Amino acid sequence: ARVKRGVIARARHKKILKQAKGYYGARSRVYRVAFQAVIKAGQYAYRDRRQRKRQFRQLWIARINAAARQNGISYSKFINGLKKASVEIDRKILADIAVFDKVAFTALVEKAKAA
Amino acid sequence: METIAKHRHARSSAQKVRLVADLIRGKKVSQALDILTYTNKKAAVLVKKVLESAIANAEHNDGADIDDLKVTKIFVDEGPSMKRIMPRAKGRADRILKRTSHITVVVSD
Amino acid sequence: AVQQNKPTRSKRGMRRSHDALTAVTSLSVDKTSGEKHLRHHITADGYYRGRKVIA
Amino acid sequence: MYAVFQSGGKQHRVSEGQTVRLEKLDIATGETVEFAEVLMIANGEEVKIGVPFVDGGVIKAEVVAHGRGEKVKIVKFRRRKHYRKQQGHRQWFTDVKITGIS
Amino acid sequence: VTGSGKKPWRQKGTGRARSGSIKSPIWRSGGVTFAARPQDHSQKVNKKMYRGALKSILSELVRQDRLIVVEKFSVEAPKTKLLAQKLKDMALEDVLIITGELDENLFLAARNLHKVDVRDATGIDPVSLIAFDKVVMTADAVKQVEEMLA
Amino acid sequence: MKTFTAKPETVKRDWYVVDATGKTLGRLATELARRLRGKHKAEYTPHVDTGDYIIVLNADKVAVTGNKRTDKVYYHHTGHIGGIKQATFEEMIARRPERVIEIAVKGMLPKGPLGRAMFRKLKVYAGNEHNHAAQQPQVLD
RNA sequence: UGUAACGGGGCUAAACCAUGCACCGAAGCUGCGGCAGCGACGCUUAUGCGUUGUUGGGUAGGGGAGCGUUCUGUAAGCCUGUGAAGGUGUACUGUGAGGUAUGCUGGAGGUAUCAGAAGUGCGAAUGCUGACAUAAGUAACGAUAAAGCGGGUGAAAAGCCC
RNA sequence: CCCGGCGAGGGGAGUGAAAAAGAACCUGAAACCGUGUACGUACAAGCAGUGGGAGCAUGCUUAGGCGUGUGACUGCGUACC
Ligand SMILES: [Mg+2]
Ligand SMILES: [Mg+2]
Ligand SMILES: [Mg+2]
Ligand SMILES: [Mg+2]
Ligand SMILES: [Mg+2]
Ligand SMILES: [Mg+2]
Ligand SMILES: [Mg+2]
Ligand SMILES: [Mg+2]
Ligand SMILES: [Mg+2]
Ligand SMILES: [Mg+2]
Ligand SMILES: [Mg+2]
Ligand SMILES: [Mg+2]
Ligand SMILES: [Mg+2]
Ligand SMILES: [Mg+2]
Ligand SMILES: [Mg+2]
Ligand SMILES: [Mg+2]
Ligand SMILES: [Mg+2]
Ligand SMILES: [Mg+2]
Ligand SMILES: [Mg+2]
Ligand SMILES: [Mg+2]
Ligand SMILES: [Mg+2]
Ligand SMILES: [Mg+2]
Ligand SMILES: [Mg+2]
Ligand SMILES: [Mg+2]
Ligand SMILES: [Mg+2]
Ligand SMILES: [Mg+2]
Ligand SMILES: [Mg+2]
Ligand SMILES: [Mg+2]
Ligand SMILES: [Mg+2]
Ligand SMILES: [Mg+2]
Ligand SMILES: [Mg+2]
Ligand SMILES: [Mg+2]
Ligand SMILES: [Mg+2]
Ligand SMILES: [Mg+2]
Ligand SMILES: [Mg+2]
Ligand SMILES: [Mg+2]
Ligand SMILES: [Mg+2]
Ligand SMILES: [Mg+2]
Ligand SMILES: [Mg+2]
Ligand SMILES: [Mg+2]
Ligand SMILES: [Mg+2]
Ligand SMILES: [Mg+2]
Ligand SMILES: [Mg+2]
Ligand SMILES: [Mg+2]
Ligand SMILES: [Mg+2]
């Protein structure tokens, strides 16, 4: 028996165009172009789930290095000082304590000074 | 009242008429009627007739009151084209489109 | 001769920006009859500067 | 009053009273949990570790929601090598409300 | 397809895509690459497979209790009014009546009745026995089927 | 949780003065580019112009080691048919002593709108005098 | 074509040779989840596993398990003017093909389940047909024999009539 | 009836259950061209996305948190067959 394939096409195109919804020019409107944009977007989305973790880790270290040199220590010594006193606090939090509770960040720099 | 009036299958193109439309928007009917009198385009005569329609249209049927009438939502929409075959040199044929436009106007207050 | 690959709605818009023809916004008023007309042109009935100069 | 603790292989800087999301646990939906994995307690006296953990620093929390996250789509695609691979993911979470810090 | 052999346009020269037919499947009108022919869809079933299946489905009706065995079952005259009423006393509805001694009276007045289907014991079927909810067999009919299948 | 990104409106900036008499160009221009960017501050963000305003004065008195007073060339094209103008570190100090520090900072800053924004911060002067006493700019070293 | 033979700034250390201790740095490795593929077995029995070890980049290609479409059977059953299909949105849900429920439009059909059969799924073939873009309101308006003014007609006249 | 050239076309009134069923007439997708509304956009370079992300425009229950749209600036990033 014959199968008209008109209902199903638009179903699977509309799925894709709805993902491209937002893109500039044809990349939004036109299926052929959108399909590529949607896939490349996926590739990048996958690729940057990895880079998200790196970028933030740089960004924290920068904050900590800045915050330490206010108190008079370079990051490399500050981390080695913390690790030598078996301190387990990660970068993410150190970058938060750097910004927020500077009285608490000061005491970490003393805690690290011992070693 | 919103009081619409329009010309469908208007024999001038969309882009040419849409150029005149620009001169009438948020504008007082009395002021807009004058402009189109002293604008020199074919589309001016075309769009005037539709506006001058819309005012009588508005005053007779529903709204009354000619003084307070501002042209709100005038817009031109590309209508059904008509394909004619202009022959070119060396035996090749070219489909020239005799384009048309739908001209709507909304005269409210 | 010929395009490499097609322009957009945007560019085509950008180009057409200047095609917007200006209005008159400068209608005269004839002194005697009070009719509106183009400056330095006669009126449609047949006046210019408050004097009939046409059949 | 705020404190720092590890749970889902990663730390969380939490205050007494507020809610926080963390990686899934094997606990009931409306049941308390006691973390003895505290790394820092900030107050007037900023208590810190010279060892693994403080000394007698407990964190009581109350489990609220046991939900699944937002969908994350995964498109592995090689160009000109006739290969694509669609895939999806909704990572689990546990949401907890902090009652007290000791 | 009803069309010319003629190459619509020559191979090269023109900028169009090389063709040699207006009957080719990739053109609107004329094609269908793999057009089906009238074909015999029926298949072989082994005697013993068929018999074994009828035995197997006819054995299951004893456990289901769909099979109703009866004595001298025959309507008085060719009238649906009697047959329709006599199923209420026996307390049935959607049936397959099977008889050895095929009475015409019983057949005539069961064409228009849809949930009833009358057969001869010779003409029992696989799908027929399975499809209908109840089944009605005469003691002669079961004697004939028993002896036929063996 | 998320990390604290800086928010322009809340950014309390500071003004500084830098005497460039007897300083090494690169060693100065680095230390400027660190500040202008705002990495010395603890609330640093790589998409926000957190860094401070600096007034470098006595730009003509800047020092350079070796033979770079003569040998350091400053090539720049004119965007024209074959116009490749050059200038030695002497000739640059004779003409425009501000340019020297400005280029050496501009090279060390990032490219892009934020990069150009954090250069506008820098204010270079040939003379010891400056006209920004209204800001009370603190002496930086 | 332009510095153009450190990637740039720039550097007398920010170059080099040697010793030491730091740190940064990958989808490597460990941490906490979640999935699948195998092979041992506690002895359960047709399987959860108390587990255990393990693997899981992939073209040609080989091998598994599925989604969906139209059609036929269960079906004179079941859902539908107290709103079907189609169109269009939204909110959930599944590892994926996809599903589920519902507001608008539409105004009459639809089809569970498990089977069966295919004209069964398209972005490319200078594919085929239709529609609509682009250049573009651009070139051109077909002979360099030439028009001008008045009056008429008519809504309107360089082009019609006198 | 009304505007209009005793036109084309339209608007009211009226038939009908419905006239965005009015002869192009069931449904009415897409490309394509429009009109309003929100944000962005005239010192900024490049497969135009993606990860971050202030601002701004907006809805909910609460007296504090969430969602949708836009996306300044910024790391990475040379389409598909
Ligand atoms: Mg059919
Ligand atoms: Mg889909
Ligand atoms: Mg010819
Ligand atoms: Mg090309
Ligand atoms: Mg293009
Ligand atoms: Mg443009
Ligand atoms: Mg060609
Ligand atoms: Mg055919
Ligand atoms: Mg075929
Ligand atoms: Mg640069
Ligand atoms: Mg040269
Ligand atoms: Mg150079
Ligand atoms: Mg390390
Ligand atoms: Mg594999
Ligand atoms: Mg591997
Ligand atoms: Mg069916
Ligand atoms: Mg159907
Ligand atoms: Mg359906
Ligand atoms: Mg289903
Ligand atoms: Mg099954
Ligand atoms: Mg096919
Ligand atoms: Mg197609
Ligand atoms: Mg293909
Ligand atoms: Mg070609
Ligand atoms: Mg072509
Ligand atoms: Mg065609
Ligand atoms: Mg065209
Ligand atoms: Mg041109
Ligand atoms: Mg030209
Ligand atoms: Mg021309
Ligand atoms: Mg010509
Ligand atoms: Mg000519
Ligand atoms: Mg004349
Ligand atoms: Mg002439
Ligand atoms: Mg002429
Ligand atoms: Mg007439
Ligand atoms: Mg309607
Ligand atoms: Mg039509
Ligand atoms: Mg109908
Ligand atoms: Mg229609
Ligand atoms: Mg447009
Ligand atoms: Mg600007
Ligand atoms: Mg560019
Ligand atoms: Mg550009
Ligand atoms: Mg880049």
Side-chain angles (χ1 to χ4, degrees), chain A residues 39-69:
Chain A
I39 283 167
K40 179 135 279 147
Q43 290 170 225
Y44 293 147
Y46 174 94
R47 193 182 50 70
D48 299 6
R49 274 191 283 285
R50 311 314 201 275
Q51 295 192 346
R52 170 146 93 267
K53 297 155 178 71
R54 304 176 201 177
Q55 286 179 52
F56 278 124
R57 197 171 199 284
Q58 292 183 354
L59 177 50
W60 305 330
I61 291 161
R63 297 241 173 77
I64 299 155
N65 190 12
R69 291 169 186 291

Side-chain angles (χ1 to χ4, degrees), chain B residues 84-104:
Chain B
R84 303 289 179 274
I85 302 165
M86 177 76 201
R88 316 305 302 284
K90 298 257 190 69
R92 75 176 57 76
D94 283 25
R95 281 192 182 181
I96 69 179
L97 287 74
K98 300 293 183 66
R99 305 178 107 78
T100 68
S101 66
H102 294 13
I103 308 160
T104 54

Side-chain angles (χ1 to χ4, degrees), chain E residues 46-73:
Chain E
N46 298 7
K47 275 160 179 289
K48 296 180 177 183
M49 277 165 42
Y50 179 89
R51 279 131 136 154
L54 292 192
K55 287 166 70 180
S56 191
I57 69 189
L58 196 66
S59 61
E60 194 175 49
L61 304 191
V62 174
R63 298 189 156 68
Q64 297 289 322
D65 305 307
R66 294 174 139 189
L67 193 72
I68 310 302
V69 181
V70 287
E71 74 191 337
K72 185 67 172 180
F73 180 85

Side-chain angles (χ1 to χ4, degrees), chain D residues 76-91:
Chain D
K76 301 209 281 177
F77 184 94
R78 204 85 62 203
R79 143 187 64 195
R80 300 175 274 92
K81 310 309 193 199
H82 190 68
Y83 157 71
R84 65 166 146 285
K85 196 190 273 194
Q86 202 71 29
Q87 217 176 306
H89 201 250
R90 283 162 67 78
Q91 178 61 289

